[PDB]
Write a protein that binds this ligand. Structure first.
Ligand SMILES: Nc1nc2c(ncn2[C@@H]2O[C@H](COP(=O)(O)OP(=O)(O)OP(=O)(O)O)[C@@H](O)[C@H]2O)c(=O)[nH]1
Ligand SMILES: Nc1nc2c(ncn2[C@@H]2O[C@H](COP(=O)(O)OP(=O)(O)OP(=O)(O)O)[C@@H](O)[C@H]2O)c(=O)[nH]1
Ligand SMILES: Nc1nc2c(ncn2[C@@H]2O[C@H](COP(=O)(O)OP(=O)(O)O)[C@@H](O)[C@H]2O)c(=O)[nH]1
Ligand SMILES: [Mg+2]
Ligand SMILES: [Mg+2]
Ligand SMILES: [Zn+2]
Lengths: 429, 15, 257, 39, 28, 37, 47, 432, 52, 60, 431
């Protein structure tokens, strides 16, 4: 089983670069490519994310896609840029300009042949493929458009293969764009039926975590990318290492997706400690369980207090014991039965991996299918309706083959997803 | 080593 | 003869079955849906797909088909773009897995230069018909499910589904796509002198081509016959429960499921 | 035997990449048929 | 214990075929 | 051009080990001996 | 702080290593290298 | 001769098998390499080769390579045959349909192939021991497929299914009720005796008796291996009342459907409190029927006991067994159904259970493992059925099973057959 | 060679790709024929045999 | 507006399993197995036509 | 006495003969120079007045690469220079070129060599022809040589070990034509034809020999193991000695039914060998497994006609009878109704020798299996469905037409294969 990574746009490419840095440190791979791992348990499943060259070097199984050479040049100039494959590097001269029409219809189509060639080549290089993992931002042009087109082609080429999608959904109070509601509305409807699960990243929640949970004076986009990459590694720690109670991405999808449209998930990591408060708190399974369900720990900005958890998944890493990795879940179920849905008993799945992430002897990643995720879809709904009632910023899209009908179709799908979540949130037996 | 020079300059800016 | 090679199958049979069932379309319409409305929805969906392919835009009907135009890039004298548009029809992998059919065209070949696929606009279909987009979506899901259902129920003779682009004829585990000459002529007219490749026309599985008088027009089947027959086949596929089911009103009696 | 075969194959691949990276064809070193530019 | 012989005296092979599942040409 | 040289383990193996890279035949490299063990 | 001690050993490895011995010191020291699954391990083994 | 083929399916089955085989090697004195340091009593579990090596009569199955690679890289790598240690390509992902229809179906033939190699290697086979968990995907689906294929392949050979059902309020997966209810078909039709080993009861037992604040799956599997070793010591070693697998299944199964049987072990006490107790036969027998002294989370007093089979080991004597049983009969808080006045089966072996070094069990002169068919077993089945009703009431997670290759009529039939089993427990527990 | 004459009393050989990288062939199972001793011969046994 | 819950009810209850893998037809089960193929008489037909053409040139 | 003449046609035949003669020399202690330091070899080796031991082999090939390599190889001093017959240019995957144009100018001296080998022999058992109908000279020249041997040497036994083309992998596109055309000779002028397609050997080496990179060398080593297991009966003393005639009369029920599968067990790696107790019953079960054969042919898709067992080593008829009884009691494998006996047995006291540097681990007992079964129609149906898809509109037929056969030979081969299919179909019929 292998997860081949695809990363699109500036946000997606930088997130993928930080992810590959984290994975290389976990598996002992240096920036150059050698293996300095203390134990070869790291190497025994290194094929999941790394392809071995005949010289013993390890190359990430990654596809760097963008419409601007600048992001590719920066990521290859980074400390771990030398690790990636130049053939895997793919870029276009003319950027999307935060336009889904450029990202999907005009400039995406010309370069999608090359990205499909590279992705397929890596696919048959895989002896057995678990699936694809695409990281991107829905607020941009190249991240949203070409990312959605890649997802649409990849799902239909490999129907039974997992399609992880890590989409950074933009927010009003951190937004640095005026057409990001258009891009998100035009992209996430494709994510609805083209990806088997799309956990959502929010920059405002990441900044809130860095401000309070991490107490970081000067975190950056790289710090937010590392926040995402921690969970991106914890989600497949079970694939990459043996564990007491192992799982895989299909197991997580089966346990977290009750209905096909309900695959947009929560986002959390634990423990998240500041430099000063590291020694002042006792890290253990109990505090991990309490911090994973903490709303302020959540790296998606939609507090669960207004929603209900369809399902939850806790991927713990480190030497542990099962009764307490599970009775904490049972206790939180009992004490938050109001916040957990009644008609689906035992909402929480627990997975155990014996190898903790670098820097800890104990960690956990939380992925929840809470019904509060409808909040950001709602907000982008009002933003989209506000800009679409006057047809503002629509000529940019519609001069390039796009027209009015699919904008209304995207709003239609937004209402469909919102009602799909709301009806199951308030449904009774 | 232009990449290395870029890394060093980014480190100085970060500092 | 009514023994095959003649009895063409219209979409009206699928519409009648969808209307006479406890399916999604009936739930959405609260039992007010009709086979006539199903036929109207299917016809306008075919028209919308035909318009989408006219617009050099590949159209995907969910879980049923992905009709796409393969484009070939040839540089003219002054290096202006000249297009060779080759229509191509491949079923959705979901449908192929659902009903164990095989596509003549492999999928990477299909999407190497297929244009960007978009969903058929259910809202436009509903606007043309006169109903709700939710009704249209329920109707199309039920229709495609029963279209695939027909073969697994019983599969030798043709089932010809009409689409604006062309007719798809279903055999046991095999299908055959016949692009309609009207749609091909419209592509040639609206291509803007770029050039349209006439796709391979396999020999028609029914005498007279896909545009042949089907069982309805010939008189082989009627609405009453279809109703009685669908009741009979539902009874045949139904299976008994192992033990008495308490049921309401204290009726432990078994029940076919 | 398997370990020795893997080692010799890997070494022969190392010589492979060394020759390919040092080759005049790939590195554009040295002219009617091979004129490149002014020195 | 089920060993049926033809009148000529030849052992016929036993069968476990329940019946003919009529895979036919479609009609409702 | 500015991609990076060999990997460090690659240097190690190259040091541990225009000319033809391999110049032996199949039924000359096939094993026909038993080791001391 | 102090660098974390290198410990990559599964619960099942600990079980099999200390299942025959009363105390860890009597048990063989944990070795980072794991023994080869077969003489020539490949993907053909996995079905 | 006089052997029994061990099959381990899935995650839980594989760790249970690892614990079981380390315990068996400890019993019979085989080093992890596979060699020795009338000792042929190992023949029931280890096939002996002319070299003197003893290969276990075991078969590991798991759709995910990690667990079997763990086994192949563990201490007992040279103990196990390279074959009969099958590795899957990708896991069943907690999906019964995935393990039974579309992925388990194309390796069940290799499963039967290696099982048949074991069968032809062996000569006096008494049956199969299928260790798995119905909560998961592989252990449910592929386990059901393997059991039902073995049913037609080997006829009326005994198939003891040691199964880890989902526990009442301790849970691991959300599709656990689905997988359990679906696998109950095969565990009901193609299994003579099924033994519950849910994790909750073992957890409470470890917490309250073994005085271990942090036990894990390692200790749970140690306990399960101790239970299976105690059960099969009658055929492993010499004893007062030698009982075979079929010998006790015929007495534990009153009706073809009525065969799920709870289990318990005694004395399970840590070494810190083990020397503080008169670990007599009467004491251990009384501790067996303790609701918290068993390995199944169901109160036995909430139903009519139907048949208890006791496996005594060590210096235990038949009259202390009989006095304990007479006291149990007098203690009518646990009552037998009216049509089974006997209700007891006794099997005494002279070999005390050898503790696993580094384990949590204490060395005891005598031990007892009891397996009971009782109508109180309906509690856990009804709880799982109600969870299934809540989940299936509006088709949650059914799309996974259907898109992976199973009908909805199968779900409905599973619920209906489980309701029939619910009614049957109460029918047979009714007074005459 | 049709299946419903070839498999009158035996299960079909369900083809399965795993275990092979090429076309699957089959796998034998342990199923035994019913006891059909030739008439009148003594119960002749060379070595220990699995009893039907 | 729809009741998404009930829509999922009927959708899931009505859709049938997929991804099932059945067997390729037996090569011995071919329709032309055991007898001469239908196109072989055609092949002999053009063989005879070519031979007759050469014989006609010789006769000329 | 009891001599046997080996003939190797084509590249496949030449390499198979290389492996076979390596193994034979290893068994008989004959060094590559051709002398034993310190007379079962008389079957395959002939004494010379100078003390050399010349093999009774003819390496006939139409192109010089393989024969030249054999000449320049380790067994240069072993192989008689005249016994290594090499043409100038190959048949180039053309049965026509190997049977009508180039095959004729070398077959005369091939028969001259065969005569010079046979006149030395006194008790010649027969001929062992190793070839492959996939190629041109392996099919065409092999067919010509078989016809010329049948027309003059009479009713001598002829074991044609043929590497038939594989069900789905092709190293050539015209091999369906080649095999279909050569099946004429391999149906009328071969005493017993042995299926040896490569994919079954590849699967055996993948799953049992435990090698991630098998090659032609390993395939030929396994083929040589099978050949030695079959022919050791007429060389070494054994409990039950059977000859080529002895088992052909048992494996040929009808004149048109002489195609047979091979299997060999145990065929295991060194790691797996000591992990198992290889008994007679165990090895017999591994033999009768449909997976353990050297043909991509499924017995469970057919019925058994006859099976010949070559036991080697410390095998005893004691356990041979028990294994046969267990196999008969098994139900998955079915024997045809008109052959209740269906079994042929032969035991040898000589265990199979292991080639140095090989992948087979030494086993105290082993057994090979040569079987005629109705399942042969499966591989014939596959291969001629390939042929029919090929010949529907006459692709790659101008080559054969221009290389000197009438195109009606393709048709005649088609009806010949149709008749072979039909009687394969109807001789397994229940009476
Ligand atoms: N007693 C015990 N039970 C275990 C162990 N590991 C897993 N389980 C059981 O397995 C259940 C979860 O199922 P899975 O994680 O899918 O494991 P599985 O049942 O083998 O199914 P697969 O993972 O698909 O092979 C839990 O409820 C546990 O009861 C173990 O080591 N000991
Ligand atoms: N088992 C085995 N088969 C071989 C070997 N070499 C070639 N073959 C067979 O030869 C077939 C291909 O035919 P060719 O390439 O024409 O070789 P050929 O049959 O000897 O015929 P020529 O090349 O004309 O000499 C393949 O299908 C193989 O089965 C070998 O070394 N071992
Ligand atoms: N977490 C994170 N967010 C980023 C990063 N870079 C950009 N973003 C977010 O992405 C939004 C702009 O997206 P954009 O870069 O135009 O997407 P693109 O067109 O696909 O490259 C901004 O609002 C940022 O908040 C990054 O490195 N990390
Ligand atoms: Mg698992
Ligand atoms: Mg050649
Ligand atoms: Zn009609």
């Amino acid at each position: 089983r292998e997860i081949v990574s695809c990363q699109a746009g500036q946000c997606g490419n930088q997130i993928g670069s930080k992810f590959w840095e984290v994975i290389s440190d976990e598996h002992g791979v240096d920036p150059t490519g050698t293996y300095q791992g203390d134990s070869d348990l790291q190497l025994e499943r290194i094929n999941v994310y790394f392809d071995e060259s005949s010289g013993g070097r390890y190359v990430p199984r990654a596809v760097l896609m963008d419409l601007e050479p600048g992001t590719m040049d920066s990521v290859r100039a980074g400390p771990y840029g030398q690790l990636f494959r130049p053939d895997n590097f793919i870029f276009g001269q003319s950027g999307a300009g935060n336009n889904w029409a450029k990202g999907h219809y005009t400039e995406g189509a010309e370069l999608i042949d090359s990205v499909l060639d590279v992705c397929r080549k890596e696919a048959e290089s895989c002896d057995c493929l678990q699936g694809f993992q695409l990281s991107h931002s829905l607020g941009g042009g190249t991240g949203s458009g070409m990312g959605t087109l890649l997802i649409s082609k990849l799902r239909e080429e490999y129907p039974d293969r997992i399609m992880m999608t890590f989409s950074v959904i933009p927010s009003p109070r951190v937004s640095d764009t005026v057409v990001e509601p258009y891009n998100t509305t035009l992209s996430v409807h494709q994510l609805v039926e083209n990806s088997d699960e799309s956990m959502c990243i929010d920059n405002e929640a990441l900044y809130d975590i860095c401000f309070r949970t991490l107490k970081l004076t000067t975190p950056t986009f790289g710090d937010l990318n590392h926040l995402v990459a921690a969970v991106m590694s914890g989600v497949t720690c079970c694939l990459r290492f043996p564990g007491q109670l192992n799982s895989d991405l299909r197991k997580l999808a089966v346990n977290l997706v009750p209905f096909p449209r309900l695959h947009f998930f929560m986002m959390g990591f634990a423990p998240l400690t500041s430099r000063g408060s590291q020694q002042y708190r006792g890290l253990s399974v109990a505090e991990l369980t309490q911090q994973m369900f903490d709303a302020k720990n959540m790296m998606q900005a939609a507090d669960p207090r207004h929603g209900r958890y369809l399902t939850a998944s806790a991927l713990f890493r480190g030497r542990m014991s099962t009764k307490e990795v599970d009775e904490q879940m049972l206790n939180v179920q009992n004490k938050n039965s109001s916040y957990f849905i009644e008609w689906i008993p035992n909402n929480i799945k627990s997975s155990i991996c014996d190898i903790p992430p670098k820097g800890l002897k104990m960690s956990v990643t939380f992925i929840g299918n809470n019904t509060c995720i409808q909040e950001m879809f709602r907000r982008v709904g009002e933003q989209f309706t506000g800009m679409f009632r006057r047809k503002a910023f629509l000529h940019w899209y519609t001069g390039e083959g796009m027209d009015e009908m699919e904008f209304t179709e995207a709003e239609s799908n937004m209402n469909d997803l919102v009602s799909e979540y709301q009806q199951y949130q308030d449904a009774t037996v | 080593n232009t990449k290395t020079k870029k890394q060093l300059f980014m480190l100085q800016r970060a500092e | 003869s009514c023994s095959g090679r003649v009895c063409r199958g219209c979409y009206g049979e699928i519409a009648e079955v969808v209307s006479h069932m406890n399916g999604v379309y009936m739930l959405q319409t609260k039992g007010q849906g009709t086979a006539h409305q199903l036929n109207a929805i299917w016809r306008v969906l075919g028209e919308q797909l035909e318009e989408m392919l006219i617009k050099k835009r590949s159209g995907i009907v969910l879980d049923f088909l992905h009709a796409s135009i393969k484009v070939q890039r040839i540089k003219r004298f002054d290096n202006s773009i000249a297009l060779k548009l080759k229509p191509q029809f491949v079923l959705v992998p979901d449908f192929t897995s659902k009903f164990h059919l095989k596509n003549v065209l492999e999928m990477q070949d299909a999407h190497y230069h297929a244009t960007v696929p978009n969903t058929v606009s259910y809202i436009t279909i509903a606007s043309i018909v006169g109903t709700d987009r939710f009704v249209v979506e329920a109707a199309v899901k039920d229709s495609v499910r029963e279209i695939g259902k027909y073969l697994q129920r019983n599969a030798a003779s043709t089932l010809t589904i009409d689409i604006g682009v062309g007719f798809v004829e279903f055999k046991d585990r095999t299908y055959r796509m016949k692009w309609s000459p009207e749609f091909l002529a419209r592509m040639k007219a609206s291509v803007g002198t770029d050039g349209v490749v006439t796709p391979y026309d396999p020999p028609s599985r029914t005498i007279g081509g896909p545009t042949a008088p089907c069982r309805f027009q010939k008189g082989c089947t009627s609405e009453n016959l279809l109703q009685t027959q669908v009741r009979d086949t539902m009874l045949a596929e139904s299976r008994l429960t192992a033990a008495e089911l308490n049921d309401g009103m204290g009726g432990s009696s078994y029940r076919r499921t | 035997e398997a370990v020795r075969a893997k080692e010799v194959d890997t070494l022969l691949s190392l010589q492979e990449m060394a020759y390919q990276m040092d080759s005049d064809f790939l590195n554009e070193r040295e002219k009617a048929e091979r004129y490149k530019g002014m020195s | 214990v089920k060993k049926d012989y033809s009148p000529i005296g030849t052992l016929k092979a036993n069968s476990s075929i329940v019946g003919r599942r009529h895979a036919r040409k479609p009609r409702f | 051009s500015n991609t990076g040289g060999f990997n460090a383990s690659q240097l190690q193996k190259l040091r541990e080990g225009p000319r033809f890279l391999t110049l032996q035949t199949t039924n000359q490299a096939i094993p026909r001996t038993f080791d001391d063990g | 702080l102090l660098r974390l001690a290198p410990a990559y050993e599964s619960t099942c490895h600990y079980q099999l290593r200390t299942g025959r011995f009363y105390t860890e010191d009597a048990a063989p020291p944990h070795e980072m290298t794991l023994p080869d699954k077969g003489v020539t391990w490949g993907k053909s083994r996995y079905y | 001769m006089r052997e029994a083929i061990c099959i381990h399916i899935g995650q839980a089955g594989c760790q249970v098998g690892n614990a079981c085989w380390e315990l068996f090697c400890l019993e019979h004195g085989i080093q992890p390499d596979g060699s020795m340091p009338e000792d042929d009593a190992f023949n029931t579990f280890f096939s002996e080769t002319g070299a003197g090596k003893h290969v276990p009569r075991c078969l590991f199955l798991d759709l995910e390579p990690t667990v079997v690679d763990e086994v192949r890289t563990g201490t007992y790598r040279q103990l196990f045959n390279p074959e009969q240690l099958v590795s899957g390509k990708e896991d069943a992902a907690n999906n019964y349909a995935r393990g039974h229809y579309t992925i388990g179906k194309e390796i069940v033939d290799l499963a039967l192939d290696r099982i048949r190699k074991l069968a032809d290697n062996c000569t006096g086979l008494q049956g199969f021991m299928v260790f798995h968990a119905v909560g998961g995907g592989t252990g449910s689906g592929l386990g059901a497929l393997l059991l039902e294929r073995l049913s037609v392949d080997y006829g009326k050979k005994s198939k003891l299914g040691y199964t880890v059902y989902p526990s009442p309020q301790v849970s691991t997966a959300v599709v656990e009720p689905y997988n359990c209810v679906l696998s109950t078909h095969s565990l009901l039709e193609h299994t003579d005796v099924a033994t519950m080993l849910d994790n909750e009861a073992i957890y409470d037992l470890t917490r309250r008796s073994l005085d271990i604040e942090r036990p894990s799956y390692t200790n749970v599997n140690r306990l399960i291996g101790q239970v299976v070793s105690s059960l099969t010591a009658s055929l492993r070693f010499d004893g007062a009342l030698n009982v075979d697998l079929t010998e006790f299944q015929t007495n534990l199964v009153p009706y073809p459907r009525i065969h799920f049987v709870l289990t318990s072990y005694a004395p399970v006490v840590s070494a810190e409190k083990a020397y503080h107790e008169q670990l007599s036969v009467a004491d251990i027998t009384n501790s067996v029927f303790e609701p918290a002294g068993m390995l199944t989370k169901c109160d036995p007093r909430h139903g009519k006991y139907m048949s208890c089979c006791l496996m005594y080991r060590g210096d235990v004597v038949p009259k202390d067994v009989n006095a304990a049983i007479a006291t149990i009969k007098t203690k009518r808080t646990i009552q037998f159904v009216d049509w089974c006045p006997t209700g007891f089966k006794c099997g005494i072996n002279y070999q005390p259970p050898t503790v696993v070094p580094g384990g949590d069990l204490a060395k005891v002169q005598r031990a007892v493992c009891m397996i009971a068919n009782s109508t109180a077993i309906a509690e856990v089945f009804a709880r799982i059925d109600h969870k299934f009703d809540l989940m299936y009431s509006k088709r949650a997670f059914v799309h996974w099973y259907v898109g992976e290759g199973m009908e909805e009529g199968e779900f409905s039939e599973a619920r209906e057959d489980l309701a029939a089993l619910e009614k049957d427990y109460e029918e047979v527990g009714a007074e005459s | 060679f049709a299946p419903e004459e070839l498999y009158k009393n035996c299960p079909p050989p369900v083809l399965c790709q795993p275990g092979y990288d090429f076309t699957p062939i089959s796998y034998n199972t342990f199923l035994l024929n019913p006891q059909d001793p030739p008439h009148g011969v003594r119960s002749v046994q060379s070595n220990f045999m699995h009893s039907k | 507006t729809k009741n998404f819950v009930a829509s999922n009810i009927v959708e899931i209850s009505n859709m049938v399993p997929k991804r099932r893998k059945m067997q390729a037809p037996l090569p011995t089960s071919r329709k032309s197995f055991g007898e001469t193929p239908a196109y072989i008489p055609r092949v002999k037909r053009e063989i005879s036509e070519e031979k007759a053409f050469l014989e006609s040139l010789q006769e000329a």
